[PDB]
Design a protein around this motif. Structure first.
Motif, PDB file in Angstrom:
ATOM      1  N   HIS A  41     -23.626   9.148   9.836  1.00 42.22           N
ATOM      2  CA  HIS A  41     -23.550   7.697   9.754  1.00 42.22           C
ATOM      3  C   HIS A  41     -24.165   6.988  10.980  1.00 42.22           C
ATOM      4  O   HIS A  41     -24.224   5.766  10.986  1.00 42.22           O
ATOM      5  CB  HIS A  41     -22.142   7.180   9.430  1.00 42.22           C
ATOM      6  CG  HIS A  41     -21.137   7.352  10.521  1.00 42.22           C
ATOM      7  ND1 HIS A  41     -20.299   8.443  10.553  1.00 42.22           N
ATOM      8  CD2 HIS A  41     -20.819   6.522  11.549  1.00 42.22           C
ATOM      9  CE1 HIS A  41     -19.522   8.271  11.613  1.00 42.22           C
ATOM     10  NE2 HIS A  41     -19.798   7.132  12.245  1.00 42.22           N
ATOM     11  N   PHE A 140      -8.164   8.338  19.579  1.00 41.43           N
ATOM     12  CA  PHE A 140      -9.586   8.018  19.528  1.00 41.43           C
ATOM     13  C   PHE A 140      -9.810   6.518  19.485  1.00 41.43           C
ATOM     14  O   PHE A 140      -9.065   5.819  18.827  1.00 41.43           O
ATOM     15  CB  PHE A 140     -10.201   8.659  18.256  1.00 41.43           C
ATOM     16  CG  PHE A 140     -10.240  10.168  18.213  1.00 41.43           C
ATOM     17  CD1 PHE A 140     -11.148  10.878  18.980  1.00 41.43           C
ATOM     18  CD2 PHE A 140      -9.427  10.875  17.348  1.00 41.43           C
ATOM     19  CE1 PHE A 140     -11.234  12.269  18.877  1.00 41.43           C
ATOM     20  CE2 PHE A 140      -9.484  12.270  17.291  1.00 41.43           C
ATOM     21  CZ  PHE A 140     -10.400  12.951  18.032  1.00 41.43           C
ATOM     22  N   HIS A 164     -15.057  11.790  12.829  1.00 45.29           N
ATOM     23  CA  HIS A 164     -15.853  10.814  12.092  1.00 45.29           C
ATOM     24  C   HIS A 164     -15.208   9.460  11.985  1.00 45.29           C
ATOM     25  O   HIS A 164     -15.924   8.473  12.123  1.00 45.29           O
ATOM     26  CB  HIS A 164     -16.206  11.295  10.666  1.00 45.29           C
ATOM     27  CG  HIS A 164     -17.264  12.364  10.623  1.00 45.29           C
ATOM     28  ND1 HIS A 164     -18.507  12.131  10.060  1.00 45.29           N
ATOM     29  CD2 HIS A 164     -17.216  13.646  11.060  1.00 45.29           C
ATOM     30  CE1 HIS A 164     -19.169  13.276  10.160  1.00 45.29           C
ATOM     31  NE2 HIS A 164     -18.438  14.213  10.767  1.00 45.29           N
ATOM     32  N   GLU A 166     -11.165   6.904  11.561  1.00 50.11           N
ATOM     33  CA  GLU A 166      -9.730   6.730  11.614  1.00 50.11           C
ATOM     34  C   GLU A 166      -9.260   6.154  10.289  1.00 50.11           C
ATOM     35  O   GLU A 166      -9.921   5.291   9.711  1.00 50.11           O
ATOM     36  CB  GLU A 166      -9.362   5.786  12.760  1.00 50.11           C
ATOM     37  CG  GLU A 166      -7.880   5.485  12.852  1.00 50.11           C
ATOM     38  CD  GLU A 166      -7.512   4.716  14.105  1.00 50.11           C
ATOM     39  OE1 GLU A 166      -7.022   3.573  13.966  1.00 50.11           O
ATOM     40  OE2 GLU A 166      -7.732   5.241  15.222  1.00 50.11           O
ATOM     41  N   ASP A 187     -17.536   9.557   4.076  1.00 51.90           N
ATOM     42  CA  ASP A 187     -18.087   8.733   5.134  1.00 51.90           C
ATOM     43  C   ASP A 187     -18.797   7.493   4.584  1.00 51.90           C
ATOM     44  O   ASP A 187     -20.034   7.333   4.686  1.00 51.90           O
ATOM     45  CB  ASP A 187     -18.970   9.531   6.108  1.00 51.90           C
ATOM     46  CG  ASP A 187     -20.109  10.280   5.466  1.00 51.90           C
ATOM     47  OD1 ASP A 187     -20.086  10.449   4.227  1.00 51.90           O
ATOM     48  OD2 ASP A 187     -21.015  10.723   6.205  1.00 51.90           O
ATOM     49  N   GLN A 189     -17.226   3.159   3.261  1.00 50.31           N
ATOM     50  CA  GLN A 189     -16.067   2.282   3.295  1.00 50.31           C
ATOM     51  C   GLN A 189     -15.336   2.176   1.960  1.00 50.31           C
ATOM     52  O   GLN A 189     -15.816   1.573   0.998  1.00 50.31           O
ATOM     53  CB  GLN A 189     -16.383   0.900   3.872  1.00 50.31           C
ATOM     54  CG  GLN A 189     -15.795   0.721   5.290  1.00 50.31           C
ATOM     55  CD  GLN A 189     -14.313   1.087   5.390  1.00 50.31           C
ATOM     56  OE1 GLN A 189     -13.930   2.072   6.043  1.00 50.31           O
ATOM     57  NE2 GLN A 189     -13.450   0.331   4.704  1.00 50.31           N
TER      58      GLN A 189
HETATM   59  C1  LIG Z   1     -17.977   5.936  15.092  1.00 47.53           C
HETATM   60  O1  LIG Z   1     -18.225   6.337  13.772  1.00 47.53           O
HETATM   61  C2  LIG Z   1     -16.514   6.189  15.448  1.00 47.53           C
HETATM   62  O2  LIG Z   1     -16.147   6.022  16.554  1.00 47.53           O
HETATM   63  N1  LIG Z   1     -15.587   6.674  14.442  1.00 47.53           N
HETATM   64  C3  LIG Z   1     -14.211   7.088  14.669  1.00 47.53           C
HETATM   65  C4  LIG Z   1     -13.152   6.120  15.181  1.00 47.53           C
HETATM   66  N2  LIG Z   1     -11.879   6.508  15.594  1.00 47.53           N
HETATM   67  C5  LIG Z   1     -11.082   5.345  16.013  1.00 47.53           C
HETATM   68  C6  LIG Z   1     -11.850   4.158  15.874  1.00 47.53           C
HETATM   69  S1  LIG Z   1     -13.306   4.518  15.289  1.00 47.53           S
HETATM   70  C7  LIG Z   1     -18.449   4.493  15.324  1.00 47.53           C
HETATM   71  C8  LIG Z   1     -19.978   4.490  15.243  1.00 47.53           C
HETATM   72  C9  LIG Z   1     -20.605   3.155  15.628  1.00 47.53           C
HETATM   73  C10 LIG Z   1     -20.913   2.225  14.647  1.00 47.53           C
HETATM   74  C11 LIG Z   1     -21.496   1.019  14.996  1.00 47.53           C
HETATM   75  C12 LIG Z   1     -21.762   0.745  16.330  1.00 47.53           C
HETATM   76  C13 LIG Z   1     -21.458   1.679  17.312  1.00 47.53           C
HETATM   77  C14 LIG Z   1     -20.878   2.887  16.960  1.00 47.53           C
HETATM   78  N3  LIG Z   1     -17.884   3.665  14.272  1.00 47.53           N
HETATM   79  C15 LIG Z   1     -16.845   2.699  14.555  1.00 47.53           C
HETATM   80  O3  LIG Z   1     -16.487   2.566  15.678  1.00 47.53           O
HETATM   81  C16 LIG Z   1     -16.215   1.869  13.427  1.00 47.53           C
HETATM   82  C17 LIG Z   1     -16.410   0.359  13.607  1.00 47.53           C
HETATM   83  O4  LIG Z   1     -17.390   0.095  14.574  1.00 47.53           O
HETATM   84  C18 LIG Z   1     -18.411  -0.749  14.124  1.00 47.53           C
HETATM   85  N4  LIG Z   1     -16.661   2.272  12.093  1.00 47.53           N
HETATM   86  C19 LIG Z   1     -16.314   3.567  11.509  1.00 47.53           C
HETATM   87  O5  LIG Z   1     -15.667   4.346  12.136  1.00 47.53           O
HETATM   88  C20 LIG Z   1     -16.795   3.922  10.092  1.00 47.53           C
HETATM   89  C21 LIG Z   1     -15.761   3.381   9.093  1.00 47.53           C
HETATM   90  C22 LIG Z   1     -15.960   3.885   7.656  1.00 47.53           C
HETATM   91  C23 LIG Z   1     -15.995   5.413   7.581  1.00 47.53           C
HETATM   92  C24 LIG Z   1     -17.066   5.988   8.514  1.00 47.53           C
HETATM   93  F1  LIG Z   1     -18.273   5.736   7.938  1.00 47.53           F
HETATM   94  F2  LIG Z   1     -16.929   7.346   8.564  1.00 47.53           F
HETATM   95  C25 LIG Z   1     -17.040   5.434   9.959  1.00 47.53           C
END
Ligand SMILES: *[C@@](O)(C(=O)NCc1nccs1)[C@@H](Cc1ccccc1)NC(=O)[C@@H](COC)NC(=O)[C@@H]1CCCC(F)(F)C1
Ligand SMILES: *[C@@](O)(C(=O)NCc1nccs1)[C@@H](Cc1ccccc1)NC(=O)[C@@H](COC)NC(=O)[C@@H]1CCCC(F)(F)C1
Lengths: 303, 303
Positions: A41, A140, A164, A166, A187, A189
């Motif tokens: 992702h 995390f 990946h 939360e 992975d 939403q």
């Molecule tokens: C990264 O995927 C992450 O840190 N995931 C695990 C977490 N654990 C606690 C909080 S988050 C991160 C990647 C990223 C996206 C955009 C900009 C910078 C980094 N994602 C996130 O921090 C988070 C929201 O930030 C914009 N989004 C997600 O974690 C997604 C949510 C839907 C499922 C997913 F696609 F697997 C990841």
């Protein structure tokens, strides 16, 4: 003496962490030989997370779309491919700090250490257990994706987990290092949520053995039960069934303490029925299920 | 989200561990630049532990009496001297893996990471807190002496503890890196025992803030108390007095949650008076006092 949640020394894994950026998304990667592994992702954007087609998104990318940073030195990306939910970025330099390693997939009830990272830099290490619903209770924050979980055996790092996302309850979901999720998670939403969880019975008995080895004996009794009569009560308290194989794994701990496995089961049966009466076991007021029989033997004296 | 006992990545410290042998005694050492630091009782024998004169014992030793092993490479000892309860062994080679470091002494209530070692090889890492009676609740077996405790701040390792011995209750005692014991303990065989201990109040309030940040709010109330009325109740439950300085340290956590320090004190006052009623806070059924306000800020989201 003493009994604590002990992680493996993280040195061998720290030398493998890198920062992977694609556009405005920055997350962590694992650099082994000339390949960097990271969650796929990293190629997605906030718009692309409803129902992305990762094959479509990856083909619209080129090697120059990926910035890889190993501390300060920039790593040049010479190849890219997807393996399930993981991206494999071929880089020009083989990691000189690459330890001996294996990619192994763990089972519910097994434990592993987690090296939480942010921007390619490790912030802390702690121990985790894979639950029956395939989630972990980690710690995390945003940007921790790409952090890995591992076990060490004679300088060989067995990588078992990549973080990946939360889940809504605050628990964590990830994949093995081949890109295959632990559990029915995706992975993208969705309103996905963790399934029902049970207590790991063989782990609670192993922890009761660590307490006896460390001087806690108030919970012992003269009684003994059958494996079948123990499982009837375990079922009512949402505990996993104990098998004859688990009894054979608990054997070395039973031999060291002189307390039979079914004898220890009679004490656990009473602890579940009556509670602890304001007493503690190894500094805890609840029954701990995140120490395996191996973890107890590794930490406790053999005497 | 999530809240766990998180140790610092131990990489920088693992590259400093060595095995020091003198006669039949083998223990761990810390190799920084061209000096190896280890507990001085490595020169003693079982007979020499009633009331040893370490100055007499050290003068009857020569450089060739000390075998130093850094993994596989043998280190040649070119000097030796004693600094309080620590031995300083000058070696021919400067450790190429020496990180930026400081020798700092910590206070009761502060936490640090421990890299438990056996025969110069690290086995595990975990977090510890210095108690009010200057003991720690670690996890150590025979041969763990010489294991060090540390904190990391921007790649600078502040070494604060070296393990020396276990007390009869199963708690642990050691020195700072200058050889000065934490507490009224001595490195000779006596019936020494740990003094009375109190609960670290500022740490329990910091951990209640981590719970609010992580969604646990059942223990909150509308009430507020004075600093003096809180201290009267804290005294009865064997809790350290809370000072205005502690209230100022809790300030950033209070600002992030919108819960005043004296508001949080009214909830702690009720938890001490009534208990938890079978409920849990951050997966624990007791009040946790081993997380400082710094540890909470370091791990919790700033939002
Ligand atoms: C990264 O995927 C992450 O840190 N995931 C695990 C977490 N654990 C606690 C909080 S988050 C991160 C990647 C990223 C996206 C955009 C900009 C910078 C980094 N994602 C996130 O921090 C988070 C929201 O930030 C914009 N989004 C997600 O974690 C997604 C949510 C839907 C499922 C997913 F696609 F697997 C990841
Ligand atoms: C070493 O000092 C040690 O491991 N100490 C801390 C421990 N924590 C839990 C158990 S021990 C080790 C050194 C050694 C001595 C002889 C042979 C090989 C290594 N000492 C011990 O393991 C232990 C008994 O082993 C013979 N003795 C002590 O720890 C001493 C007891 C009196 C106070 C002391 F002098 F500080 C140490």
């Amino acid at each position: 003496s003493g009994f604590r949640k002990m992680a493996f020394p993280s040195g061998k894994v720290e030398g493998c962490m890198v920062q992977v950026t694609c556009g405005t998304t920055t997350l962590n990667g694992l650099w082994l030989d000339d390949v960097v592994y990271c969650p796929r992702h990293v190629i997605c954007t906030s718009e692309d997370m409803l129902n992305p087609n990762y094959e479509d998104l990856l083909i619209r990318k080129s090697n120059h779309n990926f910035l890889v940073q190993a501390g300060n030195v920039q790593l040049r990306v010479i190849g890219h491919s997807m393996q399930n939910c993981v991206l494999k970025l071929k880089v020009d330099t083989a990691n000189p700090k690459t330890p001996k390693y294996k990619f192994v997939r763990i089972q519910p009830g097994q434990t592993f250490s987690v090296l939480a990272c942010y921007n390619g830099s490790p912030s802390g290490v702690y121990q985790c257990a894979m639950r029956h619903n395939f989630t972990i209770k980690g710690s995390f924050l945003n940007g921790s994706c790409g952090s890995v979980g591992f076990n060490i055996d004679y300088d060989c790092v067995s990588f078992c987990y990549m973080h990946h996302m939360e889940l809504p309850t605050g628990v964590h979901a990830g994949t093995d290092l081949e890109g295959n999720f632990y559990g029915p998670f995706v992975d993208r939403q969705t309103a996905q949520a963790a399934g029902t969880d049970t207590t790991i019975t063989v782990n609670v008995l192993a922890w009761l053995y660590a307490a006896v080895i460390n001087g806690d004996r108030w919970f012992l009794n003269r009684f003994t039960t059958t494996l079948n009569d123990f499982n009837l009560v375990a079922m009512k308290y949402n505990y996993e069934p104990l098998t004859q194989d688990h009894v054979d794994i608990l054997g070395p701990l039973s031999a060291q303490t002189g307390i039979a496995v079914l004898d220890m089961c009679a004490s656990l049966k009473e602890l579940l029925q009556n509670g602890m009466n304001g007493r503690t076991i190894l500094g805890s007021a609840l029954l701990e299920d995140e120490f395996t029989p191996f973890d107890v033997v590794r930490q406790c004296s053999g005497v």
